[PDB]
């Protein structure tokens, strides 16, 4: 029965997503801030896709890592084929949605991942950051302020709904994100930003003493 198969796949993926750490991505004055709970030092849940496009994920590592590699390949191919500015986060989100909606229905086991695609405006340009959330089934939702993935998303989202403020500074945004994520030290936090003030490449990780000073 297709109904039973869809229900089983949805419940399996939903139980696999919540069996993982939490990642929060929120927009601030300088762009988009990525905060992830990652005790590991080699495996990363935050990565760059293109010049102004970021990547965040939560779930089974070997699945969203492959998805990230595929997205990087697609972005580089599109950029070289036409131009760097012809690549947009919307196209990457659409490709991810198609890939996940095909895998959810065709493969034996659906991917237990939840993707986040964030895009900021180009240098010297004014535009509100765009946040896209792609689920296991293949649905894409546009979030204006913040995205919560992995673990118990509801308490963190509730805390963010009370503590969020637009055009906040990097330090205030980091404090808010950490406070919502606790509901942590530098040895278990993976922090990166999409700095819209950067000339070409906006992605920039914040680790070490620089991270320690901020929080």
Partner 1 sequence: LGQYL
Partner 2 sequence: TTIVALKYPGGVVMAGDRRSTQGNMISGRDVRKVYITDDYTATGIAGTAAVAVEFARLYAVELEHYEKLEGVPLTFAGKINRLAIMVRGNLAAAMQGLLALPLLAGYDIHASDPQSAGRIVSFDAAGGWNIEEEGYQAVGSGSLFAKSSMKKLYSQVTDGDSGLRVAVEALYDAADDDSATGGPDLVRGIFPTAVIIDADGAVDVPESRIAELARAIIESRSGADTFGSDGGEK
- Total binding residues toward a second copy, as defined by CB under 8 A: 24
Q: Note whether 207 and 185 are within 8 A (CB).
A: no
12 binds, among a second copy, partner 2, partner 1, none (CB under 5 to 8 A by kind): a second copy
Residue 47 binds to partner 2 (criterion: CB under 8 A)? yes
Please identify which residue in 10, 38, 44, 105 interacts with partner 2, judged by CB under 8 A. 44
- Specify whether the backbone of 208 is left (phi greater than 0), alpha (psi in -120 to 50) or beta: left
Distance between CA atoms of residues 95 and 68, nearest Å: 11
85 binds, among a second copy, partner 1, partner 2, none (CB under 5 to 8 A by kind): partner 2
Residue 185 binds to a second copy (criterion: CB under 8 A)? no
Distance between CA atoms of residues 147 and 185, nearest Å: 22
Residue 81 binds to partner 2 (criterion: CB under 8 A)? yes
How far is residue 137 CA from its own chain's centroid?
17
Residue 155 binds to partner 2 (criterion: CB under 8 A)? no
Distance between CA atoms of residues 23 and 161, nearest Å: 16
Task: Give contact residues for partner 2 (rule: CB under 8 A).
Answer: 44, 47-49, 69, 72, 76, 79-83, 85-86, 88, 91
């Amino acid at each position: 029965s297709p109904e039973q198969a869809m229900r089983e796949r949805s419940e399996l993926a939903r139980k696999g997503i919540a069996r993982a750490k939490s990642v929060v991505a929120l927009a601030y004055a300088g762009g988009v801030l990525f905060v992830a709970e990652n005790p590991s030092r080699s495996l990363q849940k935050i990565s760059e896709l293109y010049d102004r496009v970021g990547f965040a994920a939560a779930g089974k590592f070997n699945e969203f890592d492959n998805l990230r590699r595929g997205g990087i390949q697609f972005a580089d191919t599109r950029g070289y084929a036409y131009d760097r500015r012809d690549v947009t986060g919307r196209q990457l989100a659409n490709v991810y949605a198609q890939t996940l909606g095909t895998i959810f229905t065709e493969q034996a086991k659906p991917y237990e991942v939840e993707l986040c695609v964030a895009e900021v405006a180009h240098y010297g340009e004014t535009k509100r950051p765009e946040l896209y959330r792609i689920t296991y089934d293949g649905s894409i939702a546009d979030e204006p302020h913040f995205v919560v993935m992995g673990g118990t998303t509801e308490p963190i989202a509730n805390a963010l709904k009370e503590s969020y403020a637009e055009n906040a500074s990097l330090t205030d945004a980091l404090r808010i994100a950490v406070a919502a994520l606790r509901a942590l030290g530098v040895a278990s936090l993976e922090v990166a930003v999409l700095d819209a003030n950067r000339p070409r490449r906006a992605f920039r990780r914040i680790t070490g003493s620089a991270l320690q000073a901020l929080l």
